Every structure is written in C-alpha cells, then in structure tokens.
Symmetry: D3
Subunit: 241 residues, 6 copies
Amino acid sequence: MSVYAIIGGTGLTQLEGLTLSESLPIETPYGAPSAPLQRGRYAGREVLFLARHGHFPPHQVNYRANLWALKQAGAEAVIAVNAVGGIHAAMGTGHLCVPHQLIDYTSGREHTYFAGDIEHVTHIDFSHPYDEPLRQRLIEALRALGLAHSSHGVYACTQGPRLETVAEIARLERDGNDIVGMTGMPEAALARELDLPYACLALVVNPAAGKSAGIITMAEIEQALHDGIGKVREVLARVLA
Amino acid sequence: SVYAIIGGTGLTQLEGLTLSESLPIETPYGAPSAPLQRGRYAGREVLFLARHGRFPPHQVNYRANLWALKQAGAEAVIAVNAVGGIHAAMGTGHLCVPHQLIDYTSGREHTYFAGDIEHVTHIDFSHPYDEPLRQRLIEALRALGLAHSSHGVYACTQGPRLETVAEIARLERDGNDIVGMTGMPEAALARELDLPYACLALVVNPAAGKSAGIITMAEIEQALHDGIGKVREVLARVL
Amino acid sequence: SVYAIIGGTGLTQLEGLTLSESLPIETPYGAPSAPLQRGRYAGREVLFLARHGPPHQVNYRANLWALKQAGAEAVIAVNAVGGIHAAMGTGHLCVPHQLIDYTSGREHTYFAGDIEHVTHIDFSHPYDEPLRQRLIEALRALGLAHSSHGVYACTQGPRLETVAEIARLERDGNDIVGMTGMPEAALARELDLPYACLALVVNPAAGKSAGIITMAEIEQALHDGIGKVREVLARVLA
Amino acid sequence: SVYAIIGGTGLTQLEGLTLSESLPIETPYGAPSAPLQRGRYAGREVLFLARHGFPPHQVNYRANLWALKQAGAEAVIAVNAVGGIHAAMGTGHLCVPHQLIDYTSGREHTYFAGDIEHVTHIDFSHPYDEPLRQRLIEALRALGLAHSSHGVYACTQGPRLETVAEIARLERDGNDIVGMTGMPEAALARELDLPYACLALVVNPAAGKSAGIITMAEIEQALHDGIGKVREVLARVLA
Amino acid sequence: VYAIIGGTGLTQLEGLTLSESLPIETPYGAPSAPLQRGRYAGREVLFLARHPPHQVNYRANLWALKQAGAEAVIAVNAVGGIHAAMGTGHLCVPHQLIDYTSGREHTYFAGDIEHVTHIDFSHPYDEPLRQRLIEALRALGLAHSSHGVYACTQGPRLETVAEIARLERDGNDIVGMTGMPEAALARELDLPYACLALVVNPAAGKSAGIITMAEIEQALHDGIGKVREVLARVLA
Amino acid sequence: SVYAIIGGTGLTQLEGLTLSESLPIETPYGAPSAPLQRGRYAGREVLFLARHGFPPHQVNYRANLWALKQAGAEAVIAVNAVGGIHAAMGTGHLCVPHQLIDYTSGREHTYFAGDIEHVTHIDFSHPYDEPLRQRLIEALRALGLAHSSHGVYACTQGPRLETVAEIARLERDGNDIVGMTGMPEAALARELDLPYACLALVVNPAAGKSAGIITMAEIEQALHDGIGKVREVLARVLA
Ligand code: HPA
Ligand code: HPA
Ligand code: HPA
Ligand code: HPA
Ligand code: HPA
Ligand code: HPA
C-alpha cells in the first residue's frame, strides 16, 4: 500500500525486481534536487528513488530540495541508506547498524523550511529522529536475513568533505556516538518538518580515524561499499514487500 | 540610567509602564526585528525590543538590535529568554539566572568585527553576563519568593528545531543546565559594544529525554502564559 | 627543499635571512592575505606568508594555493594560543600532535561547488610527523620550555571563549586553543602539503587565569615570545 | 505513622518537642552510634538517632538502621551537611537529592554479606522515597525557603575532604553536592524496605569552587545560619 | 583442555560426561564448590560453579583450575545492558573492562611473597578465545556483539540511575558484579581467559519499570540454552 | 628546613650524602616499611625512607610518615615512578604534579580512624605544597631538564597495571600520569601538617598508549635511565 522513497547511492536501484520507468527533472521552491526523481514499482508498491549526489560534496547537497520533491511526488516513508565510519568497537567494517538517535555536528547547510519568508515559526520536536515502525521493519528484515547488525546506535553527523581527526573521534566517542557520516543531517529533520516518517540504514565502510592501525583509504571504502551494497539490497527487498 | 529589555511583547504589559511612540531605525548592520518602544517606568527611561519582531531565532538581526539600542541610549540590557530544562532541579515553571553559557550556534552574523576594518578586536568573554545585573535579578527573585536558580549554564543552540535526546545528553555532559536558541550571539554582541547584559531564563519545557513524552508547542505556550507574569514582577523590581 | 612559513611579520626579522621578493599572487579562490615574500636562508629557498594582512574571515584557501603554486614543499605555521592544560602557561611553546575543529562558516575545502569528483581526504593525523620532529628536535637543542605533543582546539572568534566553553574544550581533551589552526591544516593536506604547527601560549585560557584576559597582557607575551620562536625557525630552516 | 530522623542532635531542639528518652539497643550487626531517643511530635511518634557520639567511614549504619526498623520506624528522614559542587547550590542552600553516586568503599554496606542461604540483589534505581521527597519539597515551598527540588549526591569516603581535581571528576560524573554520610545508609534503608529521603544543607563550596581552602570555621558558621532553617522544615514534615 | 566458569546448568549441556567430582583445598581458602572434570568431543573439561559476588573466593577458584590443568577459561556472566544495542537476551563478547569493585581478594601478590609482580593487563580478555566465541556465535546465527566494555561493580545491590549514567559516561556497555578480579587473577596465573556475557536486564533507568528478579530469571531461563549451544561448539 | 626523601634506594647514591644505618622504630601504627636512615648532605639534615623495603597497597604509609615526623622531618619530597597518560609525557619525562585523583581503597588512609574522641576532616584542595613544587621546578629549570610544571596524578590500586578502557576513563577524568604509591601518602602527610610534594618520573606509556604491551624490563631500563636525573634534582633542592 504505502509509497516508499529510498535515498542513497545508485546501485540501490539494481535491486532485483525493481522497475524504474520515469524521470521528471523537478524544479522546487528551494531549488534543484540532486538528480531527477525515479518512480517505479516493487513487489506491488509504488517506489521512489532519489540519488543523494547526482551525475556535489555532502555539505552542499540540496537536501531541502530533495525532501520537498519526494513529499510532493507522494512519499509517505523514507528509508535513507548511509555510509559511515564505525566508532564503537563492535561496529566494524561491513556491519549494519540501524541508529535510534543522532548528534548533529553540521553547519551552514540549508537545514529548515522555517526560514526566509514565513508567517509563524515552528519548532518541531525532534526527540527521536527516526520513525520507530520503520526502524523495526529494518530490524525485522536484518534478523530474518541473519545479517550482523546493531538494532540501535547514535549517529554522529559531521560536515566533511574531509574525514575526522583522531582526537575528533575521541570527542564523538565521549559524546556517545557509535557511527559517523556526513549525510544524515539535515535530512532527518527536514523529513520531520514535513511529517515524513524517516529511518536510516547504515553501512560501516571503515573504522573511524584512530581505530584501525593504518590510515583510511578511499579504496578500503570503495571495496567495502561494493561488498555490502548487496546486503543492503536484500534488506530493502524485505522492507519493501 | 537607561535600560533595554529584550524579550517578547507581554513584557510591555508591565503595570505602571507608559510607552511614547516607536521610531523605525536604520542601522549600518541592516534592519532591527521591530521598532524600539521608548518608555518611562518608576521614573526611569526604558526601551523595549521584541526580538523575534515571526523571525526564526537563527535569522534575527541581533547586530542590528544591539546597535539600535546602543544608539538610542541603552546602558544595561536584560534579556528574557525561553528555555529547556536540562538540570533535574529546573522543571517547567523554573526561573534561572545563568552565570555562564556555551554557544552551539553557527550561521549568524555574530560580531561587529567583520570585513576589512583596519583593526580587529578580540573581546574577553570569560564571564558572559554582567554580575551587578545578575545580582539585581537574583535579589528580585528572592524578594518575591519565586522558584529560581542563582546560577546555571546556558546552552545556545541553532534551531529552529528542538534537540535530540542524544544531543541533550551531549549538552548535559558539557555542563549546561538549560538550552535555548536566542542567547548567542546576542550576549557577546552586547560586550563588543561595552553594554552590560544579563539574561533571565524561563524554563518552558523539559529538554528532550527528561519528560515522558515528546515536547508539544501546546505545553510550551502554556508555560509562557503562566510564566510571563512572574517575569514581569522581576523586571519591575529591577527597574 | 623549500619551506614556507605562515605567521606574523617579524618572523622575517630573522637574522641571516636575505629576504628579497614581495610577490602579490592571484588565486582561483581570490587574494591571499599579504604578498608572498620569497627569500633564501641557509641556502634553502624560503617562503613567507603573513596570514594577518579576523581569523574567521582569512582567505585560508588563497594562502595555501599560493604557497603551493610558489613551490612550497613543506609548511611551518606559527600560532598564538590560549593554554588550557595547567602545564602550558604564558610563554610555553607547544608542538601539537592533534586538533579539534570547532569552527564554521570558513571556506574550508577545495572540493566545493561545481566539480566532477569529490575527495574525502584522510585526516587522522593533522600534522606531519617529520616536521613535528624537526620542531621538537630544535626546541630540545635550544633548551626551551615546551611540549612534544598536545591537542589544538580551533575556535571561531574573534571573541575569546567563555569559562564554561573552556571547560567543555578541556573535557574534550584540548591542551590549547586558537582561532587559526583550521581549516589551514586541512587545506594543506588537500594540497598534499606537509604541515606542522608551532604554538606559543600568550594567555591562560578563560577561567584559568585570575581575572579577564586583556589584549595588553597578550601583546607582552608576543613581544617576549617572538624571540624564542625565531631561534626555533632558524634551527628548523638550517 | 512513625518517622525517624537521622542527623546531628540539636535537630532534637524543635520547639514543642518532648524528648521522652530512650534506651540502649543491641543488634546482630553491632552497637548503634547513640542510644535511640524516642519522642512525640504533635500526635506523631518520632525516633531520633545521631550518627556520631566516629568518622563517617566507620559509623555503623547497619546497626543504626536495623535498630530503627526494630523500634518500628516506617519512614526515615536523613539530614546531611554537604559541599556544594553546582554553581547554584552555594553555602546555606538546601537541597533534596533525587539521585546519588557512591564513591565509598571500606564499609559494612549490606545485610546480605556473610555465609547466608539466599542472596538478594535489591534494585536501587531510585535511591530516595519519592513520597518522602515531595513531603520535604512541599515543606520547603510553604516556608518560602530557597532550595533545590532535585540533585545528585556524591558520597565520598572521608575523613579528608576532596581534591580540586577530584571535584572536577565528581562534576563530570554529574554530581551536584558532596557528602560522606549518604551511603551505604540509603541502600541499607532499602534492603529493609524502609522509605528514606535526605535533606541536605550545603555548608561549604566544594574544593576549588572558591579561591581559598575549606575551613572548619566556614562550616561552623554555615551550620549556625543553617540549623534553624533545617528544624523548621522538620516541624512541618512531622505535623 | 578448557574450564568453564558459570552457573550449574551449564553442565546440562548435551554431549558432556562429568566424571570426577573432587573437592580441592588451596593456599587461599576454599573454592566456591567442588571441581568437576569431564570430556566433551574428546577434550578434557573443567567446570567450576562460582557459587555473594564481593565475597566469592575468586582466588581459590582460579588457582584450583590452574592446578587441575586448565589451559584456557571461559567465564559466563549475567549482566545488565547499558548500550542501547544490547537489550535483554543479547549475547556480548566483551574486549575491555573497567573495574569499580574493591574490598575483594584481587591478587596472588599480597601478604608474605618474596617477589611482587605488576602484571600487564592492557587486554583483559584473550583474543583467540574471543575469536572462538565470536566464530561460534556467527555459525549458530545468534544475535551478538563482537566487542564491548564490561563494567564490574561491587554489588550485591544494583546500581543507581546516576551510577549507570557515569558508567555510560565511562565507555561501558554492560554491567556485572563478577567479572573482576576473576579476569585479573586468571592473568596472574598465565591462564588465557575470555568472557561471554548474557544481558538479562536493561541497566537502571534504561527501561520502563524497575529491575526485578522475576524479570532477570526469565531472561536467564530464556538465554541459558543459547549459551549452552555456544559452549558446545567452542569445545568441539 | 629538614627534608625527608621518600623513594627507592638509588636515591641514596647522592655524592657527599652520608647515612646512619636504620635503627628500627616502633610506631602506634605498626612498623615502617624499611630502615629509616638519618643523613647529612654537606651538613644539612635529611631523612631517607625507602617505602617498599610488600606491594604498593599494603605498604604501611601511616607508619612511615609517623616515623618520619617523630624523627624531625619538616618537609617531604616523594619520588614516584608512574606511567604517562598524556601524549607529551613519554618515557623518561619528569612531572611535578599539582593535583591528584585517588582511585585506591582498602588502605589505611587516615590517622583519624579508630574509636577516638575527636574527628578531623582536613582540607585537601591542594594536595601538593606550592613552595616545594617551585623548588623542584626551579631546580629542573636550572639543570635544563625536560619536565612538566603541573599535571594530575591518578593513584590506582595495583599491583596489576590498568586496562586500556581504565586508562581511557582515567584520561577522561583529566589525569596526566598514573602510579600506585601516591595515596594515601600525600593525605597522611597533611593530617600531620607536613608540606609534601611529589616528583614523578615516567617509566612507561600507560596501558594502550603505544604499539606493544607493557614489559617489566622496559620499565626497569627506564628507571636506570632517569634515576640519575632525579639524583641531580635532589642534590640541588638539598643545597
Ligand atoms: O569515517 C568517516 N567519517 C565521516 N564520514 C564518513 N563516511 C564514511 N566514512 C566516514
Ligand atoms: O527544549 C528546548 N531546546 C532549545 N530551545 C528551547 N526553547 C525552549 N525550549 C527549548
Ligand atoms: O584564549 C584564546 N582563545 C582563542 N584564541 C586565542 N589566541 C590567544 N589566546 C586565545
Ligand atoms: O566538602 C565536602 N566534602 C565531603 N564531605 C563534606 N561534608 C560537608 N562538606 C563536605
Ligand atoms: O543491572 C545489573 N547491574 C549489575 N549487575 C548485574 N547482573 C545482572 N544485571 C545487573
Ligand atoms: O602504568 C602504570 N600504572 C600504574 N602504576 C604504575 N607504576 C609505573 N607505571 C605504572
């Protein structure tokens, strides 16, 4: 029944049995979305796909435009796939974590619809950033599949593009975070401001700075993606049905 | 001595206060959120500013406001701020006179010392609030026998959204007792202008994670309607 | 091997340095803070750039591209800082080995806007270990009071920190605090330029000193400290 | 219903308190700090027990409590003098803690030691009886007294007071006040299913929360200005 | 040859014969219960029940296992779960611990002794024994954490909400009253030791109600089976 | 001013120092951990005490200090070998701490225990004496040795060394170095109104701060390498 949107890398589009047979190049009041909207059918449910970064560094992706376009195209739930670094010792490379909280360390990103010309200011609650029904459907799928996961975790959302500093990971860890990426916020909040239920699925693509012995290389990360993307796809499959 | 009050309207509902008209001012830093209301109270020249003018806290022109009050003769400032109670002793109802703050804001025009200006000034800001003003407020709270706290750390955050349970947890680890969106750059801008400044904080909700439910704009408006009166009592004694 | 130095002027009042050029260069990112001075010290091509010419508005991109364009193969950056760790009082030299970014709004990367590829640099160790050792080696030789390692807080400014702010920063692990370490250190890596920092403590951080921190007190510590800092720079360049 | 008060004597100085006195008790755990003083307060039966006469780490809480349970106590009010970590909780402040953190060690801390047949791990999530907590708050409010409705009580070991750095760590752990008597008392009340609340008087700012060093004269003075306040609060709670 | 320290019921494992039930004395008082030798899939097996936490004779226990010929130890622990990812019924294989106990006989190097050894205790659990545990949890498709920090509190009482929060502030994930000095003692006797902890309740203030023995014992009743399946494999 | 040096022998190799053998004294608190030596260094009186003569947590510190004071000690320099937690305090480094945090327990920590008729709670805000600190500092400068003028000393129980996670918690509590002998030593020194300072030599990078694990051999090399440095300091402070 309910229409789902999936935000993430293409190749999530290589999900077996998904059709994606439309491409509207949308222009919103908030400017250009990242890629055109792709609308399709999967296991009998209407499905939406937005590439988060087009064919743009995380801190300049027009998330506002993305979420408006999806709300409008008829989204009623958004599953956001996120590549992260693992801070928690148990959340190593290849691990899947379904966060339940986040701490936002971003700045200078268009992060609300309640700015510029508005006639009342609203302060959305945001105590629990992820819709709980979605989180459970992700968990139920991950248990069913016997994939190694954490059912909770705190998402540190940093600014990039640069990776983090060892003492910077020290502080994120002292702050309670389990995992760290650059694209979680303001996405989750803009979803909230639109009453759009949103939940994040996170693939750990590297140990965060200082956890492994060497240094973080883009090929370590590229490999990890390639390795784990199929696992993510299996989870979306079960969730989408 | 002339006194600015920054906070909401309703502050203007103070018994005994008169207001004589409101001039619109042009500052070198843009437009202030609202016209200044110049008035008289207990034989003391007073100016009021309604900081939100309908503006989100992150886009308020604090620079324009402060320069505006300075130029209009201000000599001290009491800022009335609505906050979230992190500390367990500071529930809905509570009044707090913070003595310290931690700024988590970011994209705001936050200093008078920007652009090619031939000389840059680094202000001390060790003690963000003028103590004599702080003592004026505390005395008033004691004298009125109201439930308050004499000290506390103010966490100033970006908004317009409210904080995450985990973000609150982080704030609690930084030593804050309350959280709001309006305290900074306001407090620092005043010191850049050598304007003694103090805040009076009203706890209008528990911070995310401290109450049993989610925070509703309904409960927060109720805590204001119930709390603006006691605030008015405090301002009154102070002037 | 060509070293560049970023910091105040008077860092050039270095004895035996024949400083010859004043090159005003233009960059794809706008103007650098000052003209690049080129010179020779000890028979090594030596590059100077005064970053001063508001820390949060300094064109850090322009400065580093300039240095890179001019032929720099390493960078020593000199920073005035407030001291958080109790062992690191007024006058203390420190060679930080880590840093924590608390800044924002600054044009902090080369990978911004219209580009066909985004590069997420590793940045686990903000500072080059070799350069660190050249600095460490020199302080030891000159018998100066210093610290081998230490954590740099970089804060927005131009305002100093609040007592509570310093408490947060200490809780985070910071030994020192300053407004210019970042994004400079990061842009250096983006340019594959080895970068290292020599910090001089010019005030105890807020609430570590007695009363307030005056500009005057800071001024006298720069006056007193620049002497030491030159001697270190001399030895490194040598 | 029978309320038992633990604190110094001179709490016994309530106007219109008959000190009906009292008998030396024996316990399977030893000798209690003082003979129990049994009295009446406006219809109510009240028990008193001075926890001294003995350094805090050597007080025999096990006997004290056991004896108080055996004498028929149904509720225990504990009065405690403390250093004040939280900026808002200076000298002479009254606090009513809601949580505690235990840093004590060499103490006979449980009735479930020894070679015993069934082990019991009590839940101790909320270390103070909430009904008792309200009864103290209500009393404080009604008397217009400056106080804190909540706080975290650090129980250290003594007899020496704390180091500056130790205080920084108690603060990072989230403690508001610091004292030497609060545990294992609160816990031992619980193993006996005996409602228990503490009322705390800050007698000194904790180490390094002020310029000098902590003096035993400062504390004497704070108990002098403090004691009367504490007594009026018991009069109400008892009534 | 392996030794398992946990409750009895770990000896309700299918495939295990318990032969000798000899009660040993040691230079450090009596152990918690007699030692029980056996075989499981052709390996010599020591089992030893550790039954009040702060008064159990951990010294006497390990020395006994050492002298009986133990060449590795698996300690099974009931714990409360601080980490939000580790609820009731989770299995955790910790890699670190932080020790908040005291008043316990914690070292073989006290009293008399001609020489005093300050052992290194950087890594309290043995990596190869963790890996065998983890390998096993993977094969059985059980929900677990490969790593985690163990807080060892004093008891017998449970923790305060604020005690828990400072344990959380310290980087801890689980909490139990029996992890220390067991690990450290094992180390002083060059015995490889690892722990497998079963979360049996959310730590204080991590959930709705209070912590109760009804709740904790159900979780133990529920979990014991998974635990036995893990040990069965690890001895295989 | 008469100094007592507490440390290993090897501190006794000072050139020009002479020492009378032992004589074993009995104290009210049992017997000191070694022969206490009386000395002269160029005519000046010095006491020497080796604290080990037993593991760190069973050392009779109560007895040592009581012995030291009965024999006329006016000040105390204690020389401690510690692991370094701070990045800038590698092996070989000298540190003059200014604060400390006690993580010990079960040790005889006070003179004011037992069944006495008066109790003393000392202030202990500043565990090390500032005049002695500077004497050590001025000395280390005079010899131009690398050192730290300040730092926080974590005093742990032992005999085992610390876990990587324990080190991370000691680090979060703001400690710079960790040893197992510093307390209750300093505190006892105070109960006796004896000015006490520590000089701490870093013998190993604390658990989890370098590639390997910590070997006893590595530590023993480190001492044999830094005791020479410490002797020099002592010689200067004693002159
Ligand atoms: O290590 C990381 N840090 C921040 N963002 C990331 N996205 C993938 N890995 C990382
Ligand atoms: O909960 C809060 N968080 C931030 N700002 C606020 N202003 C009122 N309440 C809050
Ligand atoms: O206190 C400081 N904070 C930030 N920058 C500084 N530069 C010198 N001192 C300081
Ligand atoms: O400062 C304090 N510390 C410990 N115990 C106390 N009891 C009263 N004040 C204090
Ligand atoms: O909640 C707990 N705390 C301490 N030990 C435990 N053992 C099981 N649960 C717990
Ligand atoms: O690493 C250490 N930890 C505790 N005590 C010590 N004594 C020397 N090194 C150490």
